[PDB]
């Protein structure tokens, strides 16, 4: 039965590789070498948050570019105020193993989850005056990697074993489950149109899903190790992938290619997070060498180096307005840069 | 500032006080981790102490414990193992009755798992407590079968004590770091409320050694 496979699979992969190889007239550097360099950029530490007592594993920015959420390895989940460094809420978790926090696009819900195979959703605006658990999401078999909001009624999650799911909140039942990977899935990002998103596997592969139907439309390869973070281009036609091979890459949707590889000979550590800046000119990437490098988008030249941490950087993000940059580490501190 | 800003900073100070109290309360509890090979004596080990991760909770002689179990995780181990850096000890269950069962020797798989857990770069400063579960089965199983099927290089008779010593020393041999960590290797089937006593002795010894290395002259 596998005898037909051992030829048809190879024929199909060759017929899908030959065209994309024959549509590779030039590169990104060859065309964008004429643009002027961005010059060295310097960023100082503006505010430092001193609340946690353990490692910090996640961070997310609210829509208003003022509020913040953090989830520490201890049973806590603190909501900060990025302008005055106060605390507005503090949530005690039922399980002490969390690996992702997410903030609603409106400002009324906060979701978390981790090794407990469940995704808890908390409600912030309540008549009583305290955070109360709303729904306990179940149906997964492995650890919970990352979760994101579409609206106040739907959520996309990235399981541990193979699956990524979409379910509504009124009924704790999965609406659509799509599986095409072979290995763990860690990171996912949502396109602005809310109709498409991409997920990064651990078998050196990234796929592009469809929210409405539930099929996989495109696939990309190229890395020699696992992928740990993905962020979309602001436009909505590209995304960057971080790996443990000590390199970042930039893919294109309509091209089905890889454009440029960002890797230096001095760096040998791993990459834990990646996020684009506004207008898609800078690419902030977290590193395991105790630093956070800043790269150029249309060129490989390295911009300034953002180094103010005593442990490895795990999560970072850029606000919607584009002013602030936040980084978290396995130390208790969470820094805000500008 | 306004009145609302002062109220907000008062709320922030209250939250900080509560968090400090919670950290101080939770800072004096022992954390452990059980790792096993397939279906081992873990089920009967957890009995005398009193989805995915399961938490077990008990106290003994004015000391507070907190035990985890991640046997039913079924994922890539090297990827979620970061979170257990702060554990005090690592309990390990090994079956002595699987030296003839094959599924590929079962005891050799247990040895490989012990090697991978012990020489991992994270747990380099943490002790290991080894439980040898089955006793009564070993007595009736040695008399009929030769132990050479599990380790051919052994030379000796078919008594009990030499076989037990050989198994214990071969398990203890794989520890490359002789100085930083120590192994204890207690037997079982004598639960008799004695296993909790052994765990208490081991944890108090490891905590006093950790304190001596941290602040003392060691």
């Amino acid at each position, epitope marked *: 039965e596998l005898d037909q496979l051992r030829q048809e699979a190879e024929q199909l992969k060759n017929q899908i590789r030959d065209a994309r190889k024959a549509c590779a007239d030039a590169t990104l550097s060859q065309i964008t070498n004429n643009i002027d360099p961005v010059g060295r950029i310097q960023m100082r530490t503006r505010r430092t948050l001193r609340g946690h007592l353990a490692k910090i594993y996640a961070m997310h920015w609210g829509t208003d570019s003022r509020l913040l959420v953090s989830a520490s390895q201890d049973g806590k989940l603190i909501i900060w105020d990025s302008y005055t460094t106060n605390k507005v*809420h503090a949530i005690p978790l039922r399980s002490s193993w969390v690996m992702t926090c997410a903030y609603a696009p409106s400002g009324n819900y906060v979701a978390c989850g981790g090794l407990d195979n469940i995704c808890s959703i908390y409600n912030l605006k309540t*008549r*009583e*005056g305290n955070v109360r658990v709303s729904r306990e999401l179940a149906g997964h078999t492995g650890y919970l990697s990352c979760c994101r909001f579409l609206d106040d009624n739907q959520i996309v999650t990235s399981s541990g074993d193979t699956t990524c799911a979409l379910w509504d909140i009124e009924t704790g039942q999965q609406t659509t489950t799509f599986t095409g990977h072979t290995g763990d899935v860690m990171s996912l990002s949502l396109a602005p149109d809310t109709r498409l998103f991409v997920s990064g596997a651990c078998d050196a592969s990234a796929k592009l899903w469809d929210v409405r139907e539930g099929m996989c439309r495109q696939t990309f390869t190229g890395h020699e190790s696992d992928i740990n973070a993905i962020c979309f281009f602001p436009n909505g036609n590209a995304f960057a992938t971080g790996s443990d091979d000590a390199t970042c890459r930039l893919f294109d949707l309509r091209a089905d290619q890889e454009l440029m590889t960002y890797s230096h000979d001095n760096i040998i550590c791993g990459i834990t997070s990646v996020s684009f800046s506004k207008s898609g000119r800078l690419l902030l990437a977290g590193y395991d060498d105790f630093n956070c490098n800043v790269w150029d988008a249309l060129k490989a030249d390295r911009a300034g180096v953002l180094a103010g941490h005593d442990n490895r950087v795990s999560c970072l993000g850029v606000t919607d307005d584009g002013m602030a940059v936040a980084t978290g580490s396995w130390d208790s501190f969470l820094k805000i840069w500008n | 500032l*306004s009145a*609302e800003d*002062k*109220a907000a900073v*008062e709320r922030s100070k*209250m939250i900080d006080r509560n968090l400090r109290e919670d950290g101080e309360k939770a800072a004096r509890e022992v954390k452990l981790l059980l790792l096993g090979a397939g279906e081992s004596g873990k089920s009967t080990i957890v009995k005398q102490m009193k989805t995915g991760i399961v938490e077990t909770h008990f106290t003994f002689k004015d000391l507070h414990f907190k035990m985890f179990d991640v046997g039913g995780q079924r994922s890539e181990r090297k990827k979620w193992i970061h979170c257990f850096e702060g554990v005090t000890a690592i309990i390990f269950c090994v079956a002595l009755s699987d030296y003839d069962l094959v599924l590929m020797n079962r005891m050799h798989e247990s040895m490989k798992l012990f090697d991978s857990i012990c020489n991992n770069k994270w747990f380099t400063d943490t002790s290991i407590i080894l439980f040898l579960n089955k006793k009564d089965l070993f007595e009736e199983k040695i008399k009929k079968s030769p132990l050479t099927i599990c380790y051919p290089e052994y030379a000796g008779s078919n008594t009990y004590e030499e076989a037990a010593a050989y198994i214990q020393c071969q398990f203890e041999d794989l520890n490359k770091r002789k100085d930083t960590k120590e192994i204890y290797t207690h037997f079982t089937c004598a639960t008799d409320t004695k296993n909790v006593q052994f765990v208490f002795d081991a944890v108090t010894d490891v905590i006093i050694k950790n304190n001596l290395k941290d602040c003392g002259l060691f």
Partner: single-chain antibody
Amino acid sequence: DVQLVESGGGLVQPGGSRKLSCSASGFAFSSFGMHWVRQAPEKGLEWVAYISSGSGTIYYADTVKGRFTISRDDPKNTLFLQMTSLRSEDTAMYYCVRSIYYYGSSPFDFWGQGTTLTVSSDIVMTQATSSVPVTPGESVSISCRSSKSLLHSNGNTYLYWFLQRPGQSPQLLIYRMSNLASGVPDRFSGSGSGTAFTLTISRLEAEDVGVYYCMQHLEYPLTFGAGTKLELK
């Protein structure tokens, strides 16, 4: 669901003493701050006392500096207010109030029911209007002025609005300039700036008859207005 009930008060000789009490019912009493608001038989709305979260900051009014004491006990979820020397200007309903303070909070959310006693410099909101005839199906506007400009350096004004129908307790309508509250219809709009503030409604119904008040929250001594009755001929 949320309920505040307060009781205890009769007739007192001019110089006696009595103690009030208010009991909570399931709203996480330990995380909020409470107030006390006074109202003579047919007058406006003064201010009496205050207690904060954790029994920290405790600020009183001007007239009642030396005869009132405010205290709370988190167990049993009750609040008290003692009295020592009472003159003939202490006959009023005392209207226990709730309040929470954070970045997006809504102070003065829930107002209690009230008791009854019969003993037998700062900002001044004018609100010169007293009574205006109204008819259903049209838009009316009420004006308010303040001595000091309320636009702080943070960028947000501090002045609220209230409604009180005849024979019950007040409720919050807009908890700043241009920030509508929950549980109130969306036919209201602040549209204020500087020192001349206003409030317009879309259509007037039979449930909107009552009195509207103003309140400032820059300086801690909270002053009030005088009222604006709608008669609805």
